[PDB]
Amino acid sequence: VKCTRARRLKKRSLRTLWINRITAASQEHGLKYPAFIINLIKCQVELNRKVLADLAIYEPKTFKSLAALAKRRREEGFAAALGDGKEPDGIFSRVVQHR
Amino acid sequence: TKPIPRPDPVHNIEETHDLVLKTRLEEKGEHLEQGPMIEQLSKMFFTTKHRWYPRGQYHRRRRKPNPPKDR
Amino acid sequence: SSFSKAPQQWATFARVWYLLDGKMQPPGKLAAMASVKLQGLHKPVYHQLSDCGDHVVIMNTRHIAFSGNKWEQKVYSSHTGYPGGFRQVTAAQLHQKDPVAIVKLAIYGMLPKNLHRRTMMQRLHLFPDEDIPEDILKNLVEELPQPRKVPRRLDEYTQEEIEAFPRVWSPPEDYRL
Amino acid sequence: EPWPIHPWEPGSSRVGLIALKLGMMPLWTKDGQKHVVTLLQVQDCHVLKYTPKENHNGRMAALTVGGKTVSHFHKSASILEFYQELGLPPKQKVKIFNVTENAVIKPGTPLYAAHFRPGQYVDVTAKTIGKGFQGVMRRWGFKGQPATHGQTKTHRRPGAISTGDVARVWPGTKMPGQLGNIDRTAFGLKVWRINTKHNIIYVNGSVPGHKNCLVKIKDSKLPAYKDFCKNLPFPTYFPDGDEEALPEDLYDENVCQPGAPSITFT
Amino acid sequence: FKTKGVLKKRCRDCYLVKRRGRWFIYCKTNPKHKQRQM
Amino acid sequence: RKLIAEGPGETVLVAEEEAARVALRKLFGFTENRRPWDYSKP
Amino acid sequence: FREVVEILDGKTTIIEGRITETPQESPNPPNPTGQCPICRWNLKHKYNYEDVLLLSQFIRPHGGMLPRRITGLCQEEHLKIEECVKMAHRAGLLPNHRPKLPEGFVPKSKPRLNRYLTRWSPRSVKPIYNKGHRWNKVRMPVGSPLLKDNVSYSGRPLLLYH
RNA sequence: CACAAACGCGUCUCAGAGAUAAUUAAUGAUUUAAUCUUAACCUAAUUAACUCAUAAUAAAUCCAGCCCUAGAACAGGGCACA
Ligand SMILES: [Mg+2]
Ligand SMILES: [Mg+2]
Ligand SMILES: [Mg+2]
Ligand SMILES: [Mg+2]
Ligand SMILES: [Mg+2]
Ligand SMILES: [Mg+2]
Ligand SMILES: [Mg+2]
Ligand SMILES: [Mg+2]
Ligand SMILES: [Mg+2]
Ligand SMILES: [Mg+2]
Ligand SMILES: [Mg+2]
Ligand SMILES: [Zn+2]
Ligand SMILES: [Zn+2]
């Protein structure tokens, strides 16, 4: 019974561990986890927490590039919100449809 | 960057007998009780005293002799 | 990148000593980052089973600051086990008796309630003032920023800034101060 | 090679002695009252080692004093080495006295019962008479149960020990156990007579510990006699410093000496 | 002093002052009018 | 005054030896970031 | 500013009032249409205990408050600024606005405990020995409630009781 | 009290500093008067507690046998004067 319960809970435990590692790596770059996640999602970058943690552990340059992209997206979103202008659009804020 | 510190000094060298001088730097030894030894190890490694105590037969028999190794 | 196995492992799991100034800083915010560093929650290689833990040295403990009237309201209660041996000491009295105890208890509470709490607490060093032994000083790597900005006093402001700050109201000449 | 002697200060403290408890004697006062004195014989008092104030406590220095001589054949190798380097035979009881830095004495200095003068207040520390594992009635003084009103196997039982709701007993509960074999200190013991030839101190009141046992004597730390050491020899008693032999027995201003005119009231 | 939940002046010389975290109706002419808000 | 390689170690001598090993591997081209061996049919 | 000068010359007391030059208001306020000083300088919902340059403009040299009929502020801002001045004085700001006592500065006391955002007086609050349970808890007040209308760039409400 | 000990009915000793709650007055604005102040600055008269000076232990690796005012066993103190 405990084996079944722990098999169910293993996904949650590993997801929480991945989230903690992502928080560690993002705070190491001076960026918060919710902002990093939402800005990476806004850039249409569909990478799960497992891949993000693997990149943080083994690809520091790639993870720093992702953090810089997320910070750029956050800055563009803040600038757009402050401006409230339809014409001004950020370079990385453009939305690409399916092909 | 900063230069590499180099420490090289032999104060056990004696001009009368270098054969005894060489063994003067190697004949250093010390023995302490279990309590003081555990306290010293904990102070050195910044840990608690509960880790250094030995374990019993029940735990020492169940350890896997050949754990799997990756990479 | 192209390191041997043993040096690569040593570099990955190397311990780090951090410095933290405690002058004019809130104990809760200091203890938050102290607990983060002690647990190793700042490392992407962190794991609960792993022994990843970093040392933190906090100075200027006696110069700690409490927000609000916590100095007069917050209490610490202990019990010696013997009947009639239950004591409740005010925060000010506890700080006067031992400056370290405040931040020590704050970090002890903020740390997780497992058996590793003692192990990570043994890695913590707290000093009332800027009097740190050289053996610990030589191990410091970096200093964490202060979580709270210390406000300036009136005399600490520069005269150019004082003049640049406009006079909101004009006092009458007939009034006496 | 005497160490420099510093002037007495109001915040200074003096070193103590280690004597042997001989017995008890009566002593009558000039007002007709009768007190009981205890004889403490200073056989071998010697300063063994000196510990710096910073290395011992950070407030006061520590002076180590040895008791009466013992045999070399029953002491450990480290103790024998320490005494060989010191130059003195091993002592029985080794004690530490907290003294101020201005009253330090060179190790190896002997001490005599003339260190205390007639009329002074001393504190006595010793292990009391150990009565072993004694019952609660003898230990804490608990009253027993009635002897013959039907009580069954209870005449000396402690009775109830705790409460029902607590479901446990408090650590401060008084229970039978070891009694007597512990170090106790009696404060404010007045000294009346000092015998120089035999190095004997007559201390008023009872002395904790059995006879023929080592006793640690120091000045009174009570606030009533905090500054009584001004008239006393500050560093210690030096028999060679004065170059004058003290009388055989020094009495207090109220002690009725054995040679007396048989005082009568008027 | 009388401890009350509601304080009211019993004469024109009673004055209300906030001291020690409580309210106090103090009167000098009539000392019996000393009231302390609980 | 140009960094060619770096190496960690427990002691300074071991770190220097590891740095020398890393520099030698970089010079010889046998690096962890090298081209993987080509397994194809020419 | 008016100053009272007393001169003693042979059992004779001379009391005189002397008028000194005083600084005036800056020529250009951002909102000249505002009747209230703070409300016209657009510092409303902006100042705090940290802003000492604004609080020090109108306070007595001994740390006393200034009358509203002379200052000209609205009632709410007057109360808020009074609270901020009290908080700064309790925290330790305005070091030069204390009375000079040559006799009392020699007998030093215990070091001043560092504090900020203090609401009540340090000498009037008794320690909470019960502290309450989770559902009923005696929360510790921090800061003055009059400052709840300040601008919040983060948007999170200011915790007045913790 | 038919043991050299134990015992009371017999004898000796019993403490300095800070700190406070209630409550007193100095100085002082909001509220240029006054006002002990969930306004500051230092204030002084101040309960019991509670801590701290101070007090005790606080010299590691000889322990076969013999004594002990030391002790259930285990431990501890002595075995050179004689
Ligand atoms: Mg599923
Ligand atoms: Mg016995
Ligand atoms: Mg009876
Ligand atoms: Mg019956
Ligand atoms: Mg019976
Ligand atoms: Mg029966
Ligand atoms: Mg229970
Ligand atoms: Mg006035
Ligand atoms: Mg009056
Ligand atoms: Mg103490
Ligand atoms: Mg022995
Ligand atoms: Zn009245
Ligand atoms: Zn207004």
- What residues have CB less than 8 Å from D109, skipping those under 6 apart? D46, D47, D236
Alpha-carbon span D115 to D93, nearest angstrom: 19
Alpha-carbon span E34 to E23, nearest angstrom: 11
Please count the other Cβ atoms lying within 10 Å of the Cβ belonging to residue F3: 8
**What six digits make up the tokens of D197?**
């030839």
Alpha-carbon span D37 to D34, nearest angstrom: 10
Single out the residue of D230, D243, D236, D24 nearest to residue D116, CA to CA.
D236
- Residue D128 (CA) to nucleotide H69 (C1'), in angstroms, measures 10
- What residues have CB less than 8 Å from D243, skipping those under 6 apart? none
Gaps after residue numbers in chain G (C–N over 2.5 angstroms): none
List of D residues 102-161 with CB within 7 A of strand H: 123, 125, 127, 129-133, 138
In three state form, how does the secondary structure of C100-149 look? HHHHHHHHHHHCCCCCHHHHHHCCEEECCCCCCCHHHHCCEEEECCCCCC
Q: What are phi and psi of D258, to 5 degrees?
A: -55, -35
Alpha-carbon span D241 to D246, nearest angstrom: 12
Q: B58 to chain F nearest CA, in Å?
A: 35
DSSP classification of residue C176: B
Characterize the bridge pairing of strands C55-59 and C124-126: parallel
- Residue D3 (CA) to nucleotide H61 (C1'), in angstroms, measures 36
Burial class (CB in 10 A: 0-12, 13-18, 19+), D117: middle
Characterize the bridge pairing of strands C140-143 and C17-21: parallel
Burial class (CB in 10 A: 0-12, 13-18, 19+), E26: middle
DSSP classification of residue E19: E
DSSP classification of residue F7: -
Q: What are phi and psi of A67, to 5 degrees?
A: -65, -40
Which ligand ends up closest to the CA of A9?
1
Residue count (chain B): 71
Domain ranges for chain A: 1-99
Resolution of the coordinates, Å:
4.6
Alpha-carbon span A18 to A26, nearest angstrom: 12
Q: Which residues of G73-91 are buried (b: 16+ CB within 10 A; e: fewer)?
A: beeebbebbbbbbbbbbbb
Contact D60, D100 (CB under 8 A): yes
DSSP classification of residue D123: E
| Residue range of the domain that includes G159 | 1-162
**What six digits make up the tokens of A83?**
């401006």
Q: Which nucleotide is nearest to D70 (CA to C1')?
A: H78
List of E residues 1-38 with CB within 7 A of strand H: 1, 17-22, 24, 34, 36
Q: How was this structure determined?
A: cryo-EM
**Which amino acid is present at D96?**
I
DSSP annotation string for chain G = -EEEEEEESSS-EEEEEEE-------S--S-TT-SSHHHHHT-TTT--TT-HHHHTSS--TTS----HHHH---HHHHHHHHHHHHHHHHHT--GGGS---TTTSSS--SPPPEEES--S-TTT----SS---SSS--PPB-S-GGGTTS--SS-PPP--B-
Q: What are phi and psi of D55, to 5 degrees?
A: -85, -15
Determine which of F12, F13, F18, F32 to mutate to test the interface with B (most B C-beta atoms within 10 Å).
Answer: F12
Characterize the bridge pairing of strands D249-250 and C86-90: unpaired
Torsion of CA C117, C122, C127, C133, to 10 degrees: -160
Contact D29, D254 (CB under 8 A): yes
**What six digits make up the tokens of G129?**
């020995």
Torsion of CA E3, E8, E12, E15, to 10 degrees: 60
B vs F: CB pairs below 8 A: 3
**What six digits make up the tokens of E35?**
């009231």
**CATH fold for domain C1-177:** Ribosomal Protein L13p; Chain: A; (3.90.1180)
Alpha-carbon span G144 to G116, nearest angstrom: 11
Single out the residue of D89, D103, D102 nearest to residue D46, CA to CA.
D89
Residue D110 pairs with which residues in a beta bridge?
A: D46
Radius of gyration (Cα) for chain F, nearest Å?
14
Alpha-carbon span B14 to G131, nearest angstrom: 71
- The vertex-G91 CA angle with G86 and G97, nearest 5°, equals 65
Task: Assess whether G90 (CB) lies less than 7 A from strand H.
Answer: yes
Alpha-carbon span C6 to A38, nearest angstrom: 38
Cβ contact A28–C42 (<8 Å): yes
F4–B contact, CB cutoff 8 A: no
Q: How far is CA A48 from CA A20, A53, A65, in A?
A: 14, 9, 16
Interhelix angle C27-39/C99-110, nearest 10 degrees: 50
Cβ contact G120–E20 (<8 Å): no
Domain ranges for chain C: 1-177
Place of tokens 């490392």: C43
Contact F14, F22 (CB under 8 A): no
Determine which of G42, G52, G60, G66 to mutate to test the interface with C (most C C-beta atoms within 10 Å).
Answer: G52
Contact B41, C122 (CB under 8 A): no
Place of tokens 């004997």: D200
- What residues have CB less than 8 Å from D7, skipping those under 6 apart? D102, D234
- The vertex-D189 CA angle with D186 and D190, nearest 5°, equals 175
- What residues have CB less than 8 Å from C123, skipping those under 6 apart? B46, C38, C53, C54, C55, C56
**What six digits make up the tokens of C142?**
């970096």
**What six digits make up the tokens of C128?**
């009332």
Contact G51, G62 (CB under 8 A): no
**What six digits make up the tokens of D154?**
């209870």
Q: How far is CA B31 from CA B48, B50, D75, in A?
A: 21, 20, 22
**What six digits make up the tokens of G150?**
């300040």
**What six digits make up the tokens of D41?**
């014989």
Q: Which residues of D195-213 are buried (b: 16+ CB within 10 A; e: fewer)?
A: bbeebbbbbbeebbbeeeb
All residues of chain C having their beta carbon less than 8 Å from the beta carbon of residue D171 are 81-82
Single out the residue of C20, C91, C83 nearest to residue C57, CA to CA.
C20
Q: Which alpha helices (H) appear in C13-80, and where do they start and end? A: 27-39, 70-73
All residues of chain C having their beta carbon less than 8 Å from the beta carbon of residue D175 are none
Single out the residue of D183, D224, D30 nearest to residue D96, CA to CA.
D183
DSSP classification of residue B26: T
Residue count (chain A): 99
- Calculate how far, in angstroms, residue D21's C-alpha sits from the geometric centre of ligand 10: 30
Q: How far is CA D248 from CA C112, D192, D194, D200, in A?
A: 73, 14, 8, 11
Contact present, A and B (at least 3 Cβ pairs less than 8 Å): no
Alpha-carbon span D124 to D111, nearest angstrom: 17
- What residues have CB less than 8 Å from G44, skipping those under 6 apart? G38, G77
Domain count for chain G: 1
